[PDB]
Design an enzyme around this catalytic site. Structure first.
Site, short mmCIF file in Angstrom:
data_model
loop_
_atom_site.label_atom_id
_atom_site.label_comp_id
_atom_site.label_asym_id
_atom_site.label_seq_id
_atom_site.Cartn_x
_atom_site.Cartn_y
_atom_site.Cartn_z
N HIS A 1 0.86 -1.15 0.00
CA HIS A 1 0.00 0.00 0.00
C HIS A 1 0.93 1.24 0.00
CE1 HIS A 1 -2.98 -2.70 1.89
NE2 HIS A 1 -3.86 -1.86 1.40
N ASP B 1 12.97 19.43 6.17
CA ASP B 1 12.05 19.79 7.24
C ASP B 1 12.79 20.67 8.24
OD1 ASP B 1 10.24 20.03 9.31
OD2 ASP B 1 9.86 17.87 9.52
N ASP C 1 16.41 15.34 7.51
CA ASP C 1 14.96 15.18 7.53
C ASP C 1 14.39 15.89 6.31
OD1 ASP C 1 12.26 14.97 7.98
OD2 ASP C 1 12.35 15.77 10.02
N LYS D 1 11.20 14.85 5.20
CA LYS D 1 9.78 14.49 5.24
C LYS D 1 8.98 15.55 5.99
CE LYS D 1 10.78 10.65 7.16
NZ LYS D 1 10.55 9.40 7.94
N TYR E 1 -13.86 3.22 -2.94
CA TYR E 1 -12.85 2.38 -3.59
C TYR E 1 -12.80 2.80 -5.06
CZ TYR E 1 -12.21 -0.55 0.48
OH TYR E 1 -11.86 -1.02 1.73
N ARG F 1 -17.92 0.20 -0.45
CA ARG F 1 -17.98 -0.87 0.53
C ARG F 1 -18.88 -0.42 1.67
NH1 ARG F 1 -12.80 -4.13 2.89
NH2 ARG F 1 -12.54 -4.14 0.60
N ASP G 1 -24.73 -8.92 3.89
CA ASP G 1 -25.55 -9.07 2.70
C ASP G 1 -24.80 -9.95 1.70
OD1 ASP G 1 -23.52 -7.42 1.77
OD2 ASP G 1 -24.79 -5.66 1.49
CA LIG Z 1 -21.21 -6.99 2.88
CA LIG Z 2 9.99 15.48 9.32
#
Ligand SMILES: [Ca+2]
Ligand SMILES: [Ca+2]
Ligand SMILES: [Ca+2]
Length: 481
Positions: A108, A173, A183, A185, A263, A280, A285
């Site tokens: 992900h 940063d 840093d 980020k 989604y 979703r 069901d």
């Molecule tokens: Ca369902």
């Molecule tokens: Ca940072």
């Protein structure tokens, strides 16, 4: 005819999760074992994956994590199509895996990249899966000021010479939450720290308008209560606008029967900001996971107002009830599948709109009986020139994404490891194969597409590798528009 123009090696060190699949409780619970292979929680290939390739003028930007399991650094490569040369920046951040358990790879957690066509800033968003200040990393790093990870550059960085394409181009940063001298980020896109705005975000995906405006969208929340939020890069100010909800969180208390999660993906298509998605509901069901198929578009060039459904009717903004943007019910493709969780919709959704207004959505809808898929149905729903009745057909091959250029729609994939291209006139379901790499060319295991100015940029993972470091390639294919 469609022809392969260029084939370029990106790296021989792309990170790959060469271990076994772990469940969420295992990934959350288990300790590191030194010498283990690189196990994973979802997918096994984090590169090329996500919004990882963009083309700007003569440059192709590609993101990836470097292997192996002990490295995992965020990387950004820039290929110059004029010189044929590539330069790569190594960022200090290393993939943190599943909730900080960096020995469990987390697909992900992609690295998204965009270029602002106005000030040539580079924007990176990476390694995020709905994290928040009290995310429990189980002793693997402190995430209290690192739950949202954003890296960006100086204006004009996109087009510096290869020799100057270094971390010097990126902005550290220097806020009160800065970690120190390395840093890069940032915890916000607006210059304002805002936990409510930037926590629980996943799936960074940028898109760009015709006038050169840059936008981002992410999903906020959980699989039980989730929304799409999107913002705009303010080139005049060197920052981003506040996130704006396409749909509400907590819809069950705002007019829907229950909370729901979204989604899908926003895109810029045929001149407009638009969205397609499935829902979703998590009701007990016939739907194991997602249900329905939805689409809306904005007539506002900033995409903030004037949202409408496929019929042109205005929709509630922010959306509470998904049915306003309804296009079709994938449940109707399996109309006798009424038992609990017998309709299983877990992916394979995509959509496009051609430069002639033809609307196209594809989906995969599975019959799920005794804990197994027993039937897979692929659907193609389309409307020619934005008018007339919607046509939904199941006479559609097993493809999972749709692309567009000029008057056509395209299916692009790998067959026996070799790239192919199928094309159909927009507003039709009439596909024909128009490109297939010849026998004797290389074999690829995975690929991600980016269409730009009538060419296909295919960022690919070479098949047959071993261990946690693999080879990726960039192919540039002329679509002969
Ligand atoms: Ca369902
Ligand atoms: Ca940072
Ligand atoms: Ca349905």
């Amino acid at each position: 005819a469609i022809k392969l123009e260029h084939e370029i090696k990106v790296t021989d060190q792309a990170l790959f999760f060469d271990g076994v699949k772990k469940s969420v409780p295992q990934a959350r619970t288990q300790a590191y074992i030194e010498g283990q292979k690189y196990n994973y929680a979802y997918g096994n290939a984090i590169a090329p994956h996500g919004d990882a390739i963009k083309v700007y003028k003569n440059y192709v930007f590609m993101t990836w994590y470097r292997g192996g399991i002990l490295d995992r650094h965020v990387m950004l490569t820039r290929y110059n199509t004029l010189t044929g040369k590539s330069v790569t920046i190594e960022f200090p951040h290393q993939h943190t895996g599943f909730e900080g358990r960096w020995w469990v790879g987390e697909t992900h957690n992609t690295i998204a990249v965009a270029i602002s066509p106005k000030d040539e800033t580079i924007h990176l968003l990476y390694d995020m899966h709905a994290y928040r200040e009290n995310t429990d990393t189980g002793g693997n790093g402190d995430i209290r000021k690192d739950y949202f990870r954003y890296s960006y550059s100086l204006a004009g960085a996109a087009s510096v010479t290869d020799n100057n394409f270094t971390l010097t181009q990126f902005v550290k940063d220097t806020s009160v939450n800065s970690e120190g001298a390395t840093d890069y980020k940032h915890l916000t896109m607006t210059g304002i720290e805002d936990h409510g705005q930037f926590s629980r975000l996943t799936y960074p995906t940028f898109f760009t308008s015709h006038d050169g405006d840059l936008f981002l969208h992410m999903r906020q929340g959980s699989s039980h209560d989730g929304r799409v939020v999107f913002n705009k890069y303010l080139a005049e100010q060197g920052k981003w606008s506040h996130f704006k909800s396409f749909n509400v969180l907590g819809a069950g208390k705002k007019g829907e029967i229950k909370n729901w999660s979204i989604y899908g993906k926003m895109k810029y298509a045929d001149g407009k900001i638009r969205i397609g998605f499935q829902r979703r509901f998590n009701l007990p069901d016939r739907f194991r996971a997602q249900d329905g198929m939805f689409y809306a578009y904005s007539d506002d060039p900033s995409g903030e107002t004037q949202w409408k459904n496929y019929k042109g009717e205005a929709i509630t903004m922010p959306l509470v009830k998904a049915d306003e943007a309804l296009v079709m019910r994938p449940g109707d493709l399996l109309p006798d599948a009424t038992a609990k969780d017998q309709v299983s919709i877990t992916g394979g959704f995509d959509w496009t709109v051609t430069e002639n207004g033809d609307l196209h959505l594809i989906g995969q809808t599975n019959e799920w009986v005794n804990k197994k898929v027993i039937k897979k149905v692929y659907s193609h729903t389309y409307q020619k020139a934005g008018v007339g009745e919607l046509i939904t057909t199941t006479d559609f091959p097993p493809a999972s994404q749709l692309y567009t250029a000029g008057e056509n729609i395209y299916i692009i994939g790998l067959e026996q490891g070799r790239p192919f291209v199928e094309q159909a006139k927009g507003g039709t379901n009439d596909f024909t194969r128009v490109y297939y790499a010849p026998v004797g060319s290389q074999s690829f295991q995975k690929g991600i597409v980016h269409i730009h100015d009538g060419k296909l940029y295919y960022y690919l993972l070479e098949k047959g590798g071993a261990g946690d470091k693999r080879t990726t390639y960039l192919q540039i294919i002329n679509l002969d528009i």
